Design a binder for this molecule. Structure first.
Ligand SMILES: NC(=O)c1ccc[n+]([C@@H]2O[C@H](COP(=O)([O-])OP(=O)(O)OC[C@H]3O[C@@H](n4cnc5c(N)ncnc54)[C@H](O)[C@@H]3O)[C@@H](O)[C@H]2O)c1
Ligand SMILES: NCCCC[C@@H](N)C(=O)NCCC[C@H](N)C(=O)O
Ligand SMILES: [Mg+2]
Ligand code: NA
Length: 253
């Protein structure tokens, strides 16, 4: 059960993100998704299954999917009984997550999505569509399960991708495997486009920021302080769950 404040925050954050994405790219979240995957929604029936491997996650997904126009429902039962319930009640897409994997499975066309690459890809896509960019230089901070697919997507779109991760071994593998330029956080290079995907605060050094730069980040907590954000007028794209979820659903349509 979402508290009233929880429900209100979900819609508020989504609308905030919709506007920020429109400001940055000229399209809303839905517009980005359709252009990214070339798919469109028909209010597909989305069955959301709670998994005991439980707070408001299912309830939050319900609000999120409703916001994006999907005919969604949360099953009464959890786990395998819930799955059965969802399929029996005509779910075309199943949405469920344990601590390790959050997936969307379209039972109609057999396409399946993982939240991690779907999130990195859409946030990278948003960042890459900054209209007033004037450079193809992009900084990626965090090359984990969300960050790496995002970097890969930016490379595939022929951007000049700089990457940093505080895990050296991972940085090495990312730099050899997709042609990203290792970035030294002591490099005083300014960026107008930044994609960040870490679970840590203060991961973007001040010296890296330009005026009005786009910072596209699914990471939690925020990659920069409120002070630096206001000081450099950073165009922030950051939202806890919905954007990635939209990316998952459109990717399997
Ligand atoms: N907003 C959303 O919709 C959404 C969806 C999925 C995940 N997330 C969040 O995104 C974040 C990333 O998830 P993930 O699965 O990629 O985690 P992960 O552990 O796979 O990757 C995080 C990476 O950040 C790196 N890192 C940590 N501190 C750093 C620093 N100071 N500089 C550079 N790199 C640093 C780590 O070495 C690690 O490789 C998490 O906070 C997760 O909760 C958000
Ligand atoms: N930062 C958001 C990325 C997802 C985090 C992940 N650790 C997570 O909490 N997954 C959801 C678990 C959902 C739970 N099984 C439920 O159905 O209530
Ligand atoms: Mg999100
Ligand atoms: Na972060």
């Amino acid at each position: 059960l979402l508290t009233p404040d929880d429900l209100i925050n979900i819609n508020m954050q989504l609308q905030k993100a919709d506007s920020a994405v429109q400001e940055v790219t000229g399209l809303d979240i839905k517009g980005i998704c359709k252009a990214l995957y070339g798919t469109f929604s028909s209010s597909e029936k989305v069955g959301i299954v709670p998994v005991t491997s439980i707070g408001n996650f299912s309830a939050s997904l319900h609000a999120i999917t409703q916001y994006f126009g999907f005919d969604s429902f949360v099953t009464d039962m959890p786990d395998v009984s819930g799955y059965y319930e969802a399929v029996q009640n005509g779910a075309e897409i199943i949405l469920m997550a344990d601590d390790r994997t959050f997936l969307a499975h379209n039972l109609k066309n057999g396409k399946m999505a993982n939240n991690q690459p779907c999130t990195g890809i859409i946030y990278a896509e948003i960042a890459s569509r900054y209209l007033k960019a004037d450079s193809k230089d992009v900084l990626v901070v965090g090359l984990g399960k969300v960050g790496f697919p995002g970097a890969e997507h930016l490379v595939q779109k022929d951007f000049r991708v700089y990457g940093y991760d505080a895990d050296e071994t991972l940085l090495e593998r990312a730099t050899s495997n997709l042609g990203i330029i290792p970035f030294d956080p002591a490099n005083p290079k300014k960026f107008s486009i930044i994609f960040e995907a870490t679970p840590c605060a203060n991961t973007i050094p001040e010296a890296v920021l330009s005026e009005n730069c786009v910072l596209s980040t699914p990471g939690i907590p925020c990659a920069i302080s409120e002070e630096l954000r206001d000081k450099y007028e950073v165009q922030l794209i950051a939202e806890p769950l919905g954007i990635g979820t939209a990316s998952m659903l459109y990717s399997v349509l």
